[PDB]
Amino acid sequence: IVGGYTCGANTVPYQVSLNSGYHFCGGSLINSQWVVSAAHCYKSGIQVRLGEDNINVVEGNEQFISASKSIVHPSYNSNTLNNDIMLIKLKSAASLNSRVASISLPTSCASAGTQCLISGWGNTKSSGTSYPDVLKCLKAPILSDSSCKSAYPGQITSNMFCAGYLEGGKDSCQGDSGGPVVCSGKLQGIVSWGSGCAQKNKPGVYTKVCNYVSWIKQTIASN
Ligand SMILES: Cc1cc(CN)nn1C
Ligand SMILES: [Ca+2]
Known part of the structure; x- marks a missing residue:
């Protein structure tokens, strides 16, 4: 920004960081098990990090949950970026609270x-x-x-x-x-x-x- x-x-509280050894993209928590992000953020080995402020420091409100599956939109075109949307499912449901919310x-x-x-x-x-x-x-x-x-x-x-x-x-x-x-x-x-x-x-x-x-x-x- x-x-x-x-x-x-x-x-x-809906802002997530997608981490593959490092922050590489944002995302939005839309329910306890699912995150929406951009299709151009697709990669394997995604860990979803919820409750983040400082992404380099464990501050006490984080939940780190590995993705079990990712679903890139069927019509995503990576050249034009038309339909730049992807869903990511969490391996376990996030514990929702005032700081981690859909x-x-x-x-x-x-x-x-x-x-x-x-x-x-x-x-x-x-x-x-x-x-x-x-x-x-x-x-x-x-x-x-x-x-x-x-x-x-x-x-x-x-x-x-x-x-x-x-x-x-x-x-x-x-x-x-x-x-x-x-x-x-x-x-x-x-x-x-x-x-x-x-x-x-x-x-x-x-x-x-x-x-x-x-x-x-x-x-x-x-x-
Ligand atoms: C993610 C992103 C947003 C914008 C808009 N300035 N450019 N990129 C590369
Ligand atoms: Ca942190």
Whole structure:
């Protein structure tokens, strides 16, 4: 997260860190057994880390649970990043509490102008490289489909939306991949892609979660 703020420990209780020896992606806890992330975060040997603030220090509220299976969306295209969504099942159910909590799926799509919260442990610099240990947060509005498409000619599908600031300065970045965009207590987005970070007229692009609620529910119901 570039140009954000320190969230505060366990203030984003649905935020998870995916770890394969190191943090490599974010994710969102959607029930006691399931995490939603980006398809471009797929790899083997995933441990889901819940209750994290400082990802380098065991602070006392963590739950570390290995993934038993991952399900990349059937229509994910890694070239275009269309359908950039994946489900991860935990080997054991997380113990839910005030600091480890699920986020609700949307019942309808969110509009341009809706204010959202984006979070993660990604790079905090737009030019150089610096990775925070503690969770960073950014309040950002959803941008219009027209402005999103104008920013990225030929690249925005019906399964994507832009959020952030056309002026630059505030954005998601490398390492925030797969993490949450939450608006009015609903998971509306997943950190998917962009062109650099916090650059003018290059806002973050996010997977449009409301398009996938049926797939998520049916997949969970049979797996
Ligand atoms: C994960 C991610 C988000 C963004 C948006 N600036 N770019 N990347 C690489
Ligand atoms: Ca920790």
